[PDB]
């Protein structure tokens, strides 16, 4: 295997493919990148067994076919450490790979390419293309609501659903939930799959905000996304994900509308004096007014009064202020609508001028 290529043509690919690597976790081989030269193309692959990130680079200079694996971090650091505009010549020398540039020489240890983990072949059952920004909006709008290390591992991921002419994402940890849907102009079969937490992050990080669209392929046990010269593929999580339709409040008759930023800043200041453990704050809703209060064990107290639009009945309701702030931070709109029922029922929050995304938060008891 042999190839010479510009430093800048390797940086992004190396950065992207090193994404699935959690340092030196499982097998030693997983800390290595798979290098393969076939045709006039160099392929780089990083994996963690659960997912895989593949980069393809055009080889305009002379090359020889072959494959091997090398330590990801070191190879990347070497390439990054070389001067800008540097030509990097790489050649496999038996058990080691020689990297040369200018008067800099590096010999890296290898591991048989034949032993590099690879996701078994699978077949896609659903395919569609959509703008990168759309996939970005979908993930960002709900990512913060995925569970982290919950026993019900199926919650430690994000649901991706194709329904009608829309793609939807759902995330929840049992206390709060986020759902968002966008139209892709393509008639799609009804399908639902759970993407592992790390896959969601990798997918998100894989977007360059470019104009080039994203090609998504979904199978019974895998999901794949092609962006430019990168191909990401991840296994899916098994288990029945809760139905957001069953979680959305059934009778949120009381509707409060307020400026998202004044609301966020008020909750932010009040949170300072909330219990560090439970983060509870109290909301007192009255005609066109919202009063937010917080107190902690040492009996300190925060009180915020805001003008809002509300004509319903008076009520008090508690919430984990972090869950509320997470929502207001994700909405980043002008005004938000809070739809309540009672003090022991969840609340649905959403942009006052858009129902494409909805958030559900269970109140706290106190």
């Amino acid at each position: 295997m042999k190839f010479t290529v510009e430093r800048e043509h390797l940086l992004k690919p190396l950065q992207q493919v090193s994404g699935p690597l959690g340092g030196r976790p499982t097998l030693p081989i997983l800390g290595n990148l798979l290098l393969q030269v076939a045709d006039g193309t160099l392929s780089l692959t990083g994996t963690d067994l659960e997912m895989e990130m593949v980069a393809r680079v055009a080889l305009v200079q002379p090359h020889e076919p072959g494959a091997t694996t090398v330590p990801a971090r070191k190879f990347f650091d070497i390439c990054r450490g070389l001067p800008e505009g540097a030509e990097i010549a790489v050649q496999l020398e038996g058990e080691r790979m020689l990297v040369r540039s200018g008067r800099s020489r590096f010999s890296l240890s290898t591991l048989p390419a034949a032993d590099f983990p690879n996701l078994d072949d699978w077949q896609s059952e659903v395919e569609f293309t959509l703008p990168q920004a759309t996939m970005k909006r979908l993930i960002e709008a709900t990512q913060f609501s995925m569970a982290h290390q919950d026993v019900r591992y199926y919650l430690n991921g994000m649901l991706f659903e194709t329904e009608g002419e829309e793609l939807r994402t759902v995330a929840t940890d049992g206390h709060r939930l986020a759902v968002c849907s966008m139209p892709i102009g393509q008639s799609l079969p009804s399908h639902s799959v759970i993407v592992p937490r790390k896959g969601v992050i990798e997918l998100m990080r894989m977007l360059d905000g470019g104009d080039n669209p994203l090609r998504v392929q979904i199978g019974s046990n895998n999901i794949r996304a092609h962006v430019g010269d990168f191909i990401f593929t991840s296994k899916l999580v098994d288990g029945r994900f809760p139905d957001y339709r069953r979680v959305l409040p059934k009778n949120p008759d009381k509707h409060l509308e307020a400026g998202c930023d004044l609301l966020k800043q008020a909750f932010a200041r009040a949170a300072i004096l909330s219990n560090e453990k439970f983060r509870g704050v109290r909301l007192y809703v009255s005609e066109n007014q919202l009063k937010i209060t917080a107190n902690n064990p040492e009996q300190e107290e925060a009180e915020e009064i805001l003008d809002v639009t509300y004509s319903g009945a008076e009520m008090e309701i508690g919430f984990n202020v972090s869950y509320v702030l997470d929502v207001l931070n994700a909405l980043k709109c002008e005004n938000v609508r809070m739809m309540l029922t009672d003090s022991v029922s969840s609340v649905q929050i959403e942009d006052a001028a858009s129902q494409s995304a909805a958030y559900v938060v269970m109140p706290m008891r106190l």
Binding site: T172, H175, L177, V247, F278, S346, M362, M364
Partner: peptide, 6 residues
């Protein structure tokens, strides 16, 4: 304390 959606 905290309530659960499901």
């Amino acid at each position: 304390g905290q309530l659960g959606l499901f």
